[PDB]
Structures are given as structure tokens and as C-alpha cells.
Amino acid sequence: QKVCLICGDEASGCHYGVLTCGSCKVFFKRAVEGQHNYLCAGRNDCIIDKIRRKNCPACRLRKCLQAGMTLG
Amino acid sequence: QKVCLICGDEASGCHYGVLTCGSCKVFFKRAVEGQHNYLCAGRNDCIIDKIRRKNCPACRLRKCLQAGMTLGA
DNA sequence: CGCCTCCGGGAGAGCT
DNA sequence: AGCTCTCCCGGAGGCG
Ligand SMILES: [Zn+2]
Ligand SMILES: [Zn+2]
Ligand SMILES: [Zn+2]
Ligand SMILES: [Zn+2]
């Protein structure tokens, strides 16, 4: 069962308001809080799945917000 | 692995300075911050183990303080 | 990044 | 109507 609304990988539970895997949970916390510089080199449409997750952090962050993920 | 120095059930790790299970963890946090009104019907030496934890919160609370559990400020 | 261990705490069950 | 206890998630720090 257990599927992450962001990357399709196995979800470990509901994190920051959305059902996600472990890696997407910590990717998000780091994206908000830390020093980063993400820029899409595509059209802002990038496919986000387990194999291509690392390719476009900008699109990975975009999908997170659009699913309503947030901090405290 | 890992005993619980207070009730002996099974320890998940160290909580508030002492190696304890999860139920003692949350019992202690609540015993301090709450209106509690616990008192012993024994001689204040009651045995505290998994089967008897619920008998004497007063003594269970004393075992925590004797093991040095605290929060602070 | 992706994963781990460790500790704190909220909340909804369950038990008299 | 309180206590009690497991389940779940958040944050920090470490490591490959
Ligand atoms: Zn994911
Ligand atoms: Zn992109
Ligand atoms: Zn215990
Ligand atoms: Zn007693």
C-alpha cells in the first residue's frame, strides 16, 4: 500500500500535512529552512518519481507546495 | 533489550534523564504538570512492575524522583 | 540526498 | 469521569 503523493515511492506516513516518503519529508524541511538556489532547467513540468527525484528540486518543491505541505 | 528502571516493562530509551518505558515517560510528564492528588494506601514502599503500575501512582512517582527524573524551568 | 538513532510530545484510543 | 498507554509525528545530530 503506502504511496507518496509527491514521488510515488513508498509512503511512511503523513508529514507536514501530506502523505509522503521519508526522503520527501526531509527534502521539504531542508528546502524551506536552508540555503539552496533551486532552478528548473525545463518548463516547470518535470516528472517527479523515485528515479528522477534528485533531477529537479525546483519542481519537487513546487509539487510539495501545490499539495499543501507546510511548517509550524 | 532495555529494561525500564521504574516498572521493568520494556525501555525505549532515556526519558527526562532516566532509562524508562513509554508509559512511565508519559506518566511522569503528567504527574508533575497536573493537578494529580495521588496518595499511598500502603507504607510508601509499593512494588512497581508492569502488572502493578496502576496501583500506586504515588509510589511510581517517588521511584521516578529517586531515579532523578526531571524536566526544569 | 537518503537514512539512521534518539528524545519530546499531542491525541485518540482503552480501562476501570 | 478520570487515568493510562500506544501510536504517530516533529526536530536535532550523525554518517555513508
Ligand atoms: Zn516521496
Ligand atoms: Zn523542473
Ligand atoms: Zn516503565
Ligand atoms: Zn504506594
Range of the domain at B6: 1-73
Residues 6+ apart with CB under 8 A from A34: none
Spell out where chain A has E strands.
Answer: 13-15, 18-20
Asked if residue B33 keeps its beta carbon closer than 7 A to nucleic acid strand D, the reply is: no
Given the C-alpha cell 512492575, which residue does it identify?
Answer: B49
Structural domain count of chain B: 1
Task: Give the residue whose CA sits closest to D8 at C1'.
Answer: A13
- Resolution (angstroms) stands at 2.4
Three cell numbers at A70? 507546510
Torsion over CA of B61, B66, B69 and B73, rounded to 10 degrees? Answer: 90
**A3-9: long-range contacts at Cβ-Cβ below 8 A with a sequence spacing of 24 or more?**
A5/A67, A6/A48, A6/A60, A6/A63, A6/A64, A6/A67, A7/A48, A7/A49, A7/A50, A7/A53, A7/A60, A8/A48, A8/A49, A8/A50, A9/A49, A9/A50, A9/A53
Angstrom distance (rounded) from CA A60 to CA A52: 10
- Whether B57 and B45 have beta carbons less than 8 Å apart is answered as no
User: Residue B5: which CATH number?
Assistant: 3.30.50.10
Q: How was this structure determined?
A: X-ray
Asked if residue B25 keeps its beta carbon closer than 7 A to nucleic acid strand C, the reply is: yes
Residues 6+ apart with CB under 8 A from A37: none
